[PDB]
Structures are given as structure tokens and as C-alpha cells.
């Protein structure tokens, strides 16, 4: 009878193995065991991005933010969802918030957040 934490770890292993629907299902099993852990939802949202299920990813990001309003990954994945759904102004806001939160939390993701920001601004402009 795997625990929530155990299922999260199994889902992580499937994700690295590129088994994205299987990983998403595993994170769902984790949520069943403990639905109050934001990371399970942001992990599943990442899977949904890999699966082109943007609306499903967005909903998971919203669940995560209800449980951890400071989640860098929740804001970043939300912005990535909104970018693919052509909501550029919201995408920029969420990616900027991810940047600020990562700075506040002393997290170093290299140029990954600035890079995404330039896409959303570039795409916002190219749409204009």
C-alpha cells in the first residue's frame, strides 16, 4: 500500500522515463493519499504540459496555489500554460511573479525564467 510520498517518487521515476500519462496517474494516486501537498499538483501539471493538456495543467496549478501561494513552479507552469493558450498578458505576469519569488527564495534556475519571459513578450508583440 504505497504512501503519497512513495507514489510521488514513483511518478518522478516515470517522468524521467518519459512515461507522462503514467506519471500523471501516479501523482493522482499521491493526491488520493494526501491531497494537501502542492507539489503533487505542480508535478502533475508539468506532465499535462508534456501531454498537451493545457487546461488540465492550468487547473492543477490553481490547486497548487491554493495550498502553497509561494510556489515558484506553480506560477512558472501557469505562465507556460497561458503562453501556449495565447493569454500573453497573464503569462507575462505569472512568469514575472515566478522570477520574483525565485529571487525571494534564493533559488537559481539559470536563465530559464528570463528566457520564458522574452518569449512571452516577443510572442505578445508578434501577435501585435
Amino acid at each position: 500500500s504505497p504512501s503519497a510520498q512513495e507514489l510521488k517518487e514513483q511518478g518522478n521515476r516515470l517522468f524521467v522515463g518519459r512515461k507522462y500519462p503514467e506519471a500523471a496517474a501516479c501523482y493522482g494516486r499521491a493526491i488520493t493519499r494526501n491531497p494537501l501537498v502542492a507539489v503533487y499538483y505542480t508535478n502533475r501539471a508539468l506532465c499535462y504540459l508534456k501531454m498537451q493538456q493545457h487546461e488540465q495543467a492550468l487547473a492543477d496549478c490553481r490547486r497548487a496555489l491554493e495550498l502553497d501561494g509561494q510556489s515558484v513552479k506553480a506560477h512558472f507552469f501557469l505562465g507556460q500554460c497561458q503562453l501556449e493558450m495565447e493569454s500573453y498578458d497573464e503569462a507575462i505576469a505569472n512568469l514575472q511573479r515566478a522570477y520574483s519569488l525565485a529571487k525571494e527564495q534564493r533559488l537559481n534556475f539559470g536563465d530559464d525564467i528570463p528566457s520564458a519571459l522574452r518569449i512571452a513578450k516577443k510572442k505578445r508583440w508578434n501577435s501585435i
Binding site: K8, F15, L46, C47, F76, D112
Partner: peptide, 5 residues
């Protein structure tokens, strides 16, 4: 960033 936690 692009990996699960």
C-alpha cells in the same frame, strides 16, 4: 525548473 519535485 522543468522537472518534478
Amino acid at each position: 525548473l522543468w522537472w518534478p519535485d
